[PDB]
Design a protein around this ligand. Sequence first.
Ligand code: 9ZS
Length: 295
Amino acid sequence: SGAFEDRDPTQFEERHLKFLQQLGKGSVEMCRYDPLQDNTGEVVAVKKLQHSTEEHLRDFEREIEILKSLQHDNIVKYKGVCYSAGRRNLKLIMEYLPYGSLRDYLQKHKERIDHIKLLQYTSQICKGMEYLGTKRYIHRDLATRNILVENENRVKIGDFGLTKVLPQDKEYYKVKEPGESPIFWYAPESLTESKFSVASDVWSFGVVLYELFTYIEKSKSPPAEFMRMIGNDKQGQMIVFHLIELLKNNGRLPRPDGCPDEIYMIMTECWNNNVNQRPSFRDLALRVDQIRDNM
Ligand SMILES: O=C(Nc1nccc2[nH]c(-c3c(Cl)cccc3Cl)nc12)C1CC1
């Protein structure tokens, strides 16, 4: 009955997006996009909300804009949007990464992980973060659970739902928000003052590096280790009070078993209370690639 002109490959048609699997609960599904009706098509990941409140939808739209603005080998690829429920709902379309989160990959695929691989992932994470800096984006949620694995040789930063954009003349973003924070990845100034910056991303990167070198041994996770240092029985605000006091006076995650001193030195430089003395992501990428190249 109708003629058709497609001038926007970023608009995925609801009727052609076919369910493959539930990936985790926002919630993410794996789907097949099959406009040619032939039982094939590209496999994609689809992110949807739980509640489309004026607030959550505005945030979701901002996350979509953020992801769309990014094009880099070490950042999850934006593919498009689907305006489902007859154009009364919104879903984000992105590339599907077969190995899932780095946290899970390290846990489930120890057979294929050595220090060479760990430094390769470290390098790629720094380069993705360098790229975010050029956009003046502050991620605020760097952790191995939020980094995704394409294959043995490539990891990508995901999870842009907390990302903030710095105005031209500003060097930090103060954000007070209700609910739970990933406190064991937070820099001291984020804990005490809700201040986020490239330098606070560098602090969190230090924790990521720690996570890599612990191989996600369940007992060695940042929450497990900090809670052991703080006291395992502590609950609620008391945890935060003790974490802050600990960090302000140089309490730090321990060197993981089998971690070279030079790699631990990188973590400890990231974990500087003095914001301005933390290294840049460019400094880190160079140092890590030089370590890699010098063997
Ligand atoms: O889930 C998989 N791959 C994935 N591909 C593409 C995008 C993906 N986003 C996630 C994801 C999930 Cl479900 C929960 C929390 C945090 C993240 Cl970052 N996972 C994604 C593989 C394991 C089946």
